[PDB]
Amino acid sequence: SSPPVVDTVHGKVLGKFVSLEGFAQPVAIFLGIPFAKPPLGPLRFTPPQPAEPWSFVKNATSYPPMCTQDPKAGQLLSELFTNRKENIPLKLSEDCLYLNIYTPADLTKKNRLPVMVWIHGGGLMVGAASTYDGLALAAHENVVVVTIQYRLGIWGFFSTGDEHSRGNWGHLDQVAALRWVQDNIASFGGNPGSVTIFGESAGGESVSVLVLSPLAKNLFHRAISESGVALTSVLVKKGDVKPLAEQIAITAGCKTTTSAVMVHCLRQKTEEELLETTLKMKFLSLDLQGDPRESQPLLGTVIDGMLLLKTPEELQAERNFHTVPYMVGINKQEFGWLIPMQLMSYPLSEGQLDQKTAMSLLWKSYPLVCIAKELIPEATEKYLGGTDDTVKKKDLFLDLIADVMFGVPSVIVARNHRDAGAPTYMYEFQYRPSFSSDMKPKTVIGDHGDELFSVFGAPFLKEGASEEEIRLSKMVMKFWANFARNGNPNGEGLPHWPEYNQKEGYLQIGANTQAAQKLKDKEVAFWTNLFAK
Ligand SMILES: *[C@@](O)(c1ccccc1Cl)C(F)(F)F
């Protein structure tokens, strides 16, 4: 019964025990541990500072707020992605730099378990750590699971393109959480010499950015990007970021006289005024009015000169990144339902698409796929021209967006990582979880986020999982935690997962799981040639 109490650098923390049926050792859970000073007032749009130390024992048994964000979209994504039986309602706050810890170690003995640090998705605009319950993965695989938060949206990524607001505050928060883990996780039974970062969607892009950042040197030892990398271009702003900053300033009621003037004005706004600004900007929603080249669907990663010194393409060309073991994976249908239908309000209710509407829509999709207008016909013809059925054309259009956004970027990242001599692994995930939304057509399989339910052991926390689904989660969890332990997912009882080498082996994960070769090879060739003009 007696709750666990752990000493950290900054003070003592009190957690709680939670048992998972069939595991003798209850899991010690610590909710809402601060890893930075709350980024309020003048600390807005600045790097995170260390948390101030506290006397006595901090009660770490309540979920922290989630970072300020569109509450409706944030709650929706939490409901769609959570592995728990009931979604936990969360408060909003700028005071959100917290992490949650699930340790299966008996804290009365000494333990050095591998640590897995989860970075949540959400487009860099929404999301929360508390969505993801670490209980099942921690108990089933004997790993310490850490879920982190980081500033989002305007708070996390507002950039003037210069020294007055460089940008990438949320990525700096991720780095601060990893340094906290280095300094403290051994008190929770974890091994700071074996930290694996893993994340999905914008969280997978964050993992890829951290692989590219000198600030993350020696903070992690393996990495996993699930459905998102630093070549997912909608998340990485190149070129001139000043137009977006000025539009944000104006919407908030601020002058644009200079960068410093904009940033100081935004620093005086209340949280509520910046949230009103966020909602007026209509982020994460396909912009159908005006020139598509001016659409800004999210505030994201920039080349700031501190976290990222050059573009991801330039960094991989010079082999300037952390050559840790790296697992890069995609799902069979990344654009099948949840991103267009639930997050971005795509005009695809009809379920048939003719080629003319497809070209018009692909042009409107410019902020996602970056295809010049003169190249829209060729691109569309390559995917939709081979059939005459317009339902098939709609499905092939979804394939096209998925390949440009996720599949091709992921293979290019994996190839460049392999070519720097690092151990590299890839997967393609194909399963339709029973936990899918009731709104989701039964023909969508391997949608964006579908692997989450297997990675986080949803069949052991939510009800109604089939026996096949339970088996799948046990295998995925074991692959992931073997990778955390050894930088190699393989082990006894598991299908062989080849290294992604020059033969380009990868694992097809699903009801039938087996190795395959050359993922997306034809598509990479096509799109690389197309984007070279
Ligand atoms: C992902 O973070 C996401 C959302 C929108 C665009 C791109 C990406 Cl990677 C989410 F939200 F989980 F789907």
Residue numbers in the entry: 4 to 536
What does the original paper state about this entry?
Surprisingly, dichloro-substituted analogues F-4 deriving from analogues F-1 and F-2 exhibited more promising contribution than monosubstituted analogues, but introducing three chloride atoms into the ring was not tolerated perhaps due to their enhanced passivation effect. The covalent interactions were evaluated by nano LC-MS/MS, which offered powerful evidence to support the formation of the covalent adducts and well-explained the time-dependent inhibition of these covalent fragments. Chloro-species compounds F-3 and F-4 were chosen to detect their covalent binding sites on hCES1A. Since the activity of electrophilic warheads and the formation of covalent adducts are related to temperature, we set the incubation conditions at two different temperature points (4 °C and 25°C, respectively). This analysis certainly found several allosteric binding sites, although no expected result of any compound covalently binding to Ser221 at the catalytic cavity of hCES1A. Successfully, the co-crystallography of hCES1A with F-3 and F-4 provided promising covalent binding modes at the catalytic triad. It could be obviously seen that the carbonyl group of F-4 was attacked by the oxygen of the OH group of Ser221, forming an expected hemiacetal covalent bond. The OH of the hemiacetal group introduced multiple hydrogen interactions with Gly143, Gly142 and Ala222 nearby, stabilising the formed hemiacetal adduct and favouring binding of the compound at this site. Notably, the co-crystallisation of the parent compound F and hCES1A failed to result in similar covalent interactions. This further proves that the halogen effect may promote the formation of covalent adducts by changing the sensitivity of the electrophilic warhead. The introduction of halogen atoms, particularly chlorine, into the phenyl scaffold enhances the benzocarbonyl reactivity in forming hemiacetal adducts with serine.
